């Protein structure tokens with residue numbers, strides 16, 4: 001059984017994967033739910049405070065409870081077949097040990113100094129463990145309706161320069177040993193295995209790198225630990241042995257939760273997308289160094305297309321399409337990368353903002369540039385093989401010629417320059433957080449034409465690429481467009497009260513898409529502007545999943561088609577209706593567009609799903 | 619909005635990941651002091667996602683009203699976990715409280 005934000009709960013039999021239960025509503029948004037030990041009941045926690053224990057078979061309500069001063073944190077039926085109790089944590093910090101055989105609570109239990117994080121009955125029904133943000137375990141004596149034991153948790157020792165003394169551990173999951181005789185837990189940067197019966201620490205499984213745990217899950221089999229540290233980092237660790245077994249890429253939205261089968265042979269994976277992925281236990285252990293890194297740059301030189309990649313462990317590997325030809329390289333984790341014009345070189349940024357340009361002919365030859373307060377942002381090369389150009393936290397736009405080691409700067413006096421692009425001339429287009437659409441010069445810094453198209457930041461600005469005849473931008477205000485000849489845009493489109501978020505020019509035509517936040521596109525003729533039929537690519541959908549963001553538009557060479565890419569690719573026919581809408585991406589959330597000069601093949605990698613290559617046939 | 623109710627909502631739903639006082643520490647989320655009239659992703663000393671860092675909007679009542687209804691929808695890929703405040707009144711109250719407290 002899974003609930004949701006709607007607060008309806010749906011109960012299902014996983015095998016045949018077919019609806020086995022529909023529940024009409026739960027008052028207030030569901031907070032959590034759970035089966036009875038004999039699966040004869042289903043408790044349902046909620047913000048309302050209506051502990052609705054519906055029958056698991058008839059589906060009709062049986063038990064119901066309320067006592068909490070605040071919203072319930074957790075509900076669970078007694079693991080014992082005999083005793084019928086309902087331990088319930090809540091934001092009011094008070095535990096409520098319900099007697100399921102009675103309408104009123106068997107025992108209120110103040111104890112936690114912070115709101116309860118999780119709650120479970122102990123295999124010994126006489127005992128009742130509990131957890132909370134203070135992090136200390138609390139093994140209550142339910143039989144006496146009184147405190148018995150409560151391990152302190154400062155075991156995550158960490159002597160930082162932090163003014164706070166010993167760290168205040170915040171345990172989340174209340175994991176149990178398969179016998180339940182001891183309590184596995186996890187918090188911050190470390191898993192622990194406390195022995196509540198002796199009231200002392202035993203195990204301590206450190207998590208990957210350092211941060212603060214968002215989710216964790218012990219596995220009684222194989223001493224496994226499926227832990228979602230942060231950003232859906234659902235690694236498969238191995239407890240006690242204290243070493244990772246294997247990586248598990250594949251949830252979008254950063255997981256929302258995971259739990260193993262009672263057999264332990266499988267586990268569910270609830271996620272923010274609204275998705276639950278079943279998984280076999282065996283598959284996770286095996287290694288699978290795949291699924292390229294989420295953001296990459298690909299450069300297309302004809303018949304074979306090469307995609308930029310970040311190594312699964314360290315730097316990078318270049319894998320050409322239609323081949324197994326890996327091209328690994330070494331560096332202390334490159335921040336970003338860029339190939340030189342007319343090939344012959346390769347380059348990368350750094351966390352310090354330093355930017356090396358390794359030669360292809362010889363690994364010994366390189367130039368390293370030290371610049372920028374932080375990691376370098378945008379990087380672009382001149383039409384000449386020489387002269388690096390870059391930007392970052394600095395207000396200035398860096399122009400560092402390599403070999404010559406020249407350091408020309410674009411002194412824009414901005415808080416920072418957000419991004420910049422090459423113009424067909426010696427001019428260098430740019431824009432910052434003040435939303436100025438500056439027109440500088442390449443190599444030599446010189447702000448020749450200056451535009452203030454937006455008081456706010458330039459959200460997405462696209463330049464057409466035939467001559468320098470036009471350029472346009474939209475930034476949650478107006479879709480301005482100019483020919484550079486004027487200091488102000490030739491037209492200021494105002495056809496969208498919801499304000500256009502992004503725009504892209506036609507492939508040497510007269511079309512000009514204007515993307516909305518909801519993925520809506522409004523095509524505009526490159527002639528001041530006129531009420532052209534909106535491309536209107538998405539009309540009916542909802543908040544389902546993999547849909548947010550109007551990242552890019554890829555016009556067909558014919559110009560008769562727009563390749564919209566938000567939650568998934570859809571080839572919306574230009575002006576009214578759609579052409580080849582179909583597709584549907586596995587990853588979702590593509591953020592980049594690459595097109596071959598021919599325009600035959602575009603491959604998208606979205607959400608780290610992987611890179612997908614398309615090659616239409618006859 | 620009702621600033622007092624807004625405070626309650628902040629205490630209940632935001633305080634576990636964010637401070638509003640000047641020099642208040644970064645918790646899971648960034649300190650919100652000075653939020654109004656500031657562009658997304660600018661609290662110095664907080665490491666944002668690229669999505670939040672590049673949303674490119676100015677925080678103010680209109681943008682907050684939309685964000686707080688459904689953060690993920692407004693900034694897909696945000697690492698902020700929050701379903702959203704579905705009732706407008708509560709949103710207005712919270713926003714009115716934040717407007718006061720994040721300047722104070």
Ligand code: HEM
Nearest residue numbers: 631632635646647658659660666667670696697698699700
């Ligand atoms: C109604 C209550 C909340 C309010 C008013 C609030 C306010 C905000 C705002 C305005 C931002 C973006 C500001 C900016 O771009 O600098 C933000 C980001 C964030 N919030 Fe919240 N927040 C709330 C609840 C939460 C909760 C419950 C969590 C965690 C449980 C959280 C953690 C975060 C994080 C991690 C970010 C950074 C987003 C990113 O870097 O991708 N917030 N919050």
